[PDB]
C-alpha cells in the first residue's frame, strides 16, 4: 500500500504559502 503526499501549500506556480517540503511516500506491508 503506497501513499504519497505533497505538504507544499501552493497556489499559482510562483507562490507557496507555508514552508517548503519535498514530496514523500510511505508504504505499508502486512
Amino acid at each position: 500500500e503506497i501513499n504519497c503526499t505533497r505538504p507544499n501549500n501552493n497556489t499559482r506556480p510562483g507562490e507557496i504559502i507555508g514552508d517548503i517540503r519535498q514530496a514523500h511516500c510511505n508504504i505499508s506491508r502486512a
Partner: nanobody, 127 residues
Framework: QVQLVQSGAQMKNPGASVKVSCAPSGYTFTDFYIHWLRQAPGQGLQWMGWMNPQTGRTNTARNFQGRVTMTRDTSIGTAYMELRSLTSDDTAIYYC????????????????????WGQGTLLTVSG
C-alpha cells in the same frame, strides 16, 4: 539546558531600523522553528513571524508585510529580526521563541508551540 539569549535594549528615533538578535544554545538550532512576537503594555501579544533555521525561509504577519526581515547567521547560530521605519507604535518588548520540531514529512511552521522563550528585548522609540 536550553537558553535563548537576545540582544540588549535599544532606543531608536522614528524612521530608523532595529536589528534584534537571538542566540539559542543547549539544543540543535536547526531542529526547531524560530518565531518572533512582541508585546506592549497597552496591547496584547502580537505574532510577527517565523523562520526555518535550516533554509532561512520565513513568513511574516500581514501587518509587517514589508518592514520586517528575518534572517540567520549559520556560522554563529544566531537568528535576526529587523524592523524598519520605526514609530512610537513600535515601542514594545520583542521576543524570540522556539517552535515546532522540523520534520521532512510535514510543515510545522505554523504550530504555535513556543516551549522556550528569550528574555525579551525592550525597544523604545522616542525621537
Amino acid at each position: 539546558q536550553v537558553q535563548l539569549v537576545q540582544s540588549g535594549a535599544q532606543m531608536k528615533n522614528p524612521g530608523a531600523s532595529v536589528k534584534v538578535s537571538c542566540a539559542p544554545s543547549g539544543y540543535t538550532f536547526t531542529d526547531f522553528y524560530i518565531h518572533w512576537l512582541r508585546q506592549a503594555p497597552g496591547q496584547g501579544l502580537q505574532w510577527m513571524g517565523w523562520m526555518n533555521p535550516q533554509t532561512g525561509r520565513t513568513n511574516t504577519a500581514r501587518n509587517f508585510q514589508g518592514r520586517v526581515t528575518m534572517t540567520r547567521d549559520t556560522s554563529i547560530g544566531t537568528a535576526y529580526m529587523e524592523l524598519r521605519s520605526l514609530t512610537s507604535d513600535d515601542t514594545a518588548i520583542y521576543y524570540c521563541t522556539t517552535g515546532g520540531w522540523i520534520s521532512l514529512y510535514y510543515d510545522s511552521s505554523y504550530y504555535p508551540n513556543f516551549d522556550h522563550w528569550g528574555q525579551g528585548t525592550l525597544l523604545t522609540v522616542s525621537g
